[PDB]
Enzyme design. Structure first.
Site, short mmCIF file in Angstrom:
data_model
loop_
_atom_site.label_atom_id
_atom_site.label_comp_id
_atom_site.label_asym_id
_atom_site.label_seq_id
_atom_site.Cartn_x
_atom_site.Cartn_y
_atom_site.Cartn_z
N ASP A 1 -32.39 1.46 -32.70
CA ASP A 1 -33.25 1.30 -31.52
C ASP A 1 -33.70 -0.15 -31.30
O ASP A 1 -34.48 -0.43 -30.38
CB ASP A 1 -34.49 2.23 -31.59
CG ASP A 1 -35.46 1.87 -32.74
OD1 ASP A 1 -35.09 1.03 -33.60
OD2 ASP A 1 -36.58 2.43 -32.78
N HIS B 1 -19.50 -3.16 -47.93
CA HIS B 1 -19.61 -4.09 -49.07
C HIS B 1 -18.29 -4.81 -49.40
O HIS B 1 -18.26 -5.74 -50.21
CB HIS B 1 -20.23 -3.37 -50.29
CG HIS B 1 -21.71 -3.19 -50.16
ND1 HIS B 1 -22.53 -2.86 -51.23
CD2 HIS B 1 -22.53 -3.31 -49.09
CE1 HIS B 1 -23.78 -2.78 -50.81
NE2 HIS B 1 -23.81 -3.06 -49.52
N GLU C 1 -23.97 -10.68 -42.07
CA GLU C 1 -25.40 -10.51 -41.80
C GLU C 1 -25.65 -9.51 -40.66
O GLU C 1 -26.57 -8.71 -40.73
CB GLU C 1 -26.01 -11.85 -41.39
CG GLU C 1 -26.32 -12.77 -42.56
CD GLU C 1 -26.87 -14.09 -42.04
OE1 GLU C 1 -26.10 -14.82 -41.37
OE2 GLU C 1 -28.06 -14.37 -42.26
N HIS D 1 -29.93 -1.82 -41.46
CA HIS D 1 -31.39 -1.97 -41.61
C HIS D 1 -32.14 -1.56 -40.33
O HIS D 1 -33.27 -1.09 -40.41
CB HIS D 1 -31.76 -3.37 -42.11
CG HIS D 1 -31.38 -3.58 -43.55
ND1 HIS D 1 -32.27 -3.99 -44.52
CD2 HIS D 1 -30.21 -3.36 -44.20
CE1 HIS D 1 -31.67 -4.04 -45.69
NE2 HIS D 1 -30.41 -3.65 -45.53
N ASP E 1 -27.68 -12.95 -51.31
CA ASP E 1 -28.47 -14.19 -51.39
C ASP E 1 -29.74 -14.00 -52.21
O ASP E 1 -30.24 -14.95 -52.81
CB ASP E 1 -28.89 -14.65 -50.00
CG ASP E 1 -27.75 -15.28 -49.22
OD1 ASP E 1 -26.66 -15.48 -49.80
OD2 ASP E 1 -27.95 -15.57 -48.02
C1 HEM Z 1 -26.45 2.76 -49.55
C2 HEM Z 1 -27.39 1.94 -50.03
C3 HEM Z 1 -27.28 0.40 -49.92
C4 HEM Z 1 -27.82 -0.48 -50.78
C5 HEM Z 1 -28.63 -0.14 -52.05
C6 HEM Z 1 -27.48 -1.81 -50.32
C7 HEM Z 1 -27.85 -2.99 -50.92
C8 HEM Z 1 -27.52 -4.28 -50.51
C9 HEM Z 1 -27.97 -5.51 -51.13
C10 HEM Z 1 -28.93 -5.62 -52.34
C11 HEM Z 1 -27.41 -6.53 -50.45
C12 HEM Z 1 -27.57 -8.04 -50.70
C13 HEM Z 1 -28.81 -8.58 -49.99
C14 HEM Z 1 -29.09 -10.00 -50.47
O1 HEM Z 1 -29.57 -10.17 -51.62
O2 HEM Z 1 -28.81 -10.97 -49.71
C15 HEM Z 1 -26.61 -5.98 -49.39
C16 HEM Z 1 -25.86 -6.73 -48.50
C17 HEM Z 1 -25.10 -6.20 -47.47
N1 HEM Z 1 -25.12 -4.88 -47.03
FE1 HEM Z 1 -25.62 -3.24 -48.31
N2 HEM Z 1 -26.72 -1.68 -49.17
C18 HEM Z 1 -26.57 -0.34 -48.89
C19 HEM Z 1 -25.91 0.19 -47.79
C20 HEM Z 1 -25.30 -0.54 -46.79
C21 HEM Z 1 -24.71 -0.01 -45.58
C22 HEM Z 1 -24.70 1.49 -45.22
C23 HEM Z 1 -24.18 -1.01 -44.87
C24 HEM Z 1 -23.44 -0.83 -43.52
C25 HEM Z 1 -23.61 -1.70 -42.53
C26 HEM Z 1 -24.43 -2.25 -45.61
C27 HEM Z 1 -24.03 -3.53 -45.26
C28 HEM Z 1 -24.24 -4.69 -45.96
C29 HEM Z 1 -23.56 -5.93 -45.69
C30 HEM Z 1 -22.48 -6.20 -44.63
C31 HEM Z 1 -24.14 -6.94 -46.68
C32 HEM Z 1 -23.74 -8.41 -46.81
C33 HEM Z 1 -24.78 -9.24 -46.04
C34 HEM Z 1 -24.40 -10.72 -46.05
O3 HEM Z 1 -23.38 -11.12 -46.67
O4 HEM Z 1 -25.10 -11.52 -45.40
N3 HEM Z 1 -25.10 -1.91 -46.77
N4 HEM Z 1 -26.68 -4.60 -49.46
CA LIG Z 2 -34.78 0.77 -36.06
#
Ligand code: HEM
Ligand SMILES: [Ca+2]
Ligand SMILES: [Ca+2]
Length: 315
Positions: A62, A169, A40, A47, A175
């Site tokens: 920021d 990822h 998270e 974000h 979730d």
């Molecule tokens: C490039 C476009 C990206 C898209 C379209 C995307 C999309 C998503 C989506 C849909 C989820 C799941 C949210 C949920 O339903 O709970 C997610 C989770 C996550 N995202 Fe990505 N993401 C992107 C880029 C990134 C980047 C650059 C990072 C770098 C920090 C990142 C880190 C994460 C992490 C660590 C999770 C897991 C969160 C959890 O397990 O609580 N994402 N992302």
């Molecule tokens: Ca910001």
């Protein structure tokens, strides 16, 4: 420098991070575990940082997602982020660092708990946020490759750097994509920062792990895994497919490029020459012990090879 408790750091200004490190390892990451809270917090770094557009504004990395949470958590792409914002806010209130510093520090500390992980360079001194992110700056799993690359490129990332950042990822679950099956991971090893994400996204889709009608969701190759339509397309698009495949069984590249590209992201909206380097405060991550692999019982014929120049490695 030597800090009051005897721990050392290159610059003295970094000493204030040690009590903060101890508090988050115990009370945010549940005893320094590579679990949901770390995942998270890593999502939160992105974000926060991606709220940055030369034409529209936003201060990037920021702390605005915390300082202006009332606004930013209303954006649909920020669904589920309120949970971690509410968890981090008391830490920011208690300690004497800005929310922007805290978000990046917590993300770097978190990643360091994961086997295979890296120490993301960390700089101290971001001022408090002075504006909320503009709306509509966060990529969604239902956006086209062209749309995602255009947004990331607008914030300063090339298409290969998008692939590098998506190593995140490898330690990640969803979730909200399918709320019938919350906590379903993007790879078979959500608590290991490894190349499995890049491998498993390349497999032919087979089924939906929960319900079948979810926006932004592709067929998964495995019952216990979820696949985003964005990752499905990125793994296959001529613009990104060769770099995607290049990460497979290439942990040194994943490590090097993720650390460097995460540092760039962490510094969006900032000037590193006006900040203090405190990278050496981040803990040393454990190393991997197991080799990269296709899931058992899968073979090369299950892989949708998408790089014309280079065949998919024999795992
Ligand atoms: C490039 C476009 C990206 C898209 C379209 C995307 C999309 C998503 C989506 C849909 C989820 C799941 C949210 C949920 O339903 O709970 C997610 C989770 C996550 N995202 Fe990505 N993401 C992107 C880029 C990134 C980047 C650059 C990072 C770098 C920090 C990142 C880190 C994460 C992490 C660590 C999770 C897991 C969160 C959890 O397990 O609580 N994402 N992302
Ligand atoms: Ca910001
Ligand atoms: Ca993994």
């Amino acid at each position: 420098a030597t800090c009051d408790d005897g721990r050392t750091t290159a610059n003295a200004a970094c000493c204030i991070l040690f009590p903060i490190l101890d508090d988050i390892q115990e009370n945010l990451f549940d005893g320094a575990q590579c679990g949901e809270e770390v995942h998270e917090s890593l999502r939160l770094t992105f974000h926060d940082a991606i709220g940055f557009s030369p034409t529209l504004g936003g201060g990037g990395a920021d702390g605005s997602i915390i300082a202006f949470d009332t606004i930013e958590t209303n954006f649909p792409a920020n669904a589920g982020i309120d949970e971690i914002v509410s968890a981090q806010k008391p830490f920011v209130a208690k300690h004497n660092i800005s929310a922007g510093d805290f978000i990046q520090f917590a993300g770097a500390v978190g990643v360091s708990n994961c086997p295979g992980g890296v120490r993301i360079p960390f700089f101290l001194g971001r001022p408090d946020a002075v504006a909320a992110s503009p709306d509509h700056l966060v990529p969604e799993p239902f956006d086209s490759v062209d749309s995602i690359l255009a947004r990331m490129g607008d914030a300063g990332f090339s298409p290969v750097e998008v692939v590098y950042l998506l190593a995140s990822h490898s330690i990640a679950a969803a979730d909200k994509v399918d709320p019938s099956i919350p906590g379903t991971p993007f790879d078979s090893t959500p608590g290991v920062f490894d190349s499995q994400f890049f491998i498993e996204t390349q497999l032919k889709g087979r089924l939906f792990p929960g319900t079948a009608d979810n926006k932004g969701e592709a067929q998964s190759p495995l019952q216990g895994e979820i696949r985003l339509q964005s990752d499905h397309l990125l793994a296959r698009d001529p613009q990104t497919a060769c770099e995607w495949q290049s990460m497979v069984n290439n942990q040194p590249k994943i490590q090097n490029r993720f650390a460097a590209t995460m540092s760039k992201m962490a510094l969006l909206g900032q000037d590193k020459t006006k900040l203090i380097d405190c990278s050496d405060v981040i803990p040393t991550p454990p190393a991997l012990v197991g080799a990269a692999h296709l899931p058992a019982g899968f073979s090369l014929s299950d892989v949708e090879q998408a790089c014309a120049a280079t065949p998919f490695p024999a795992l």
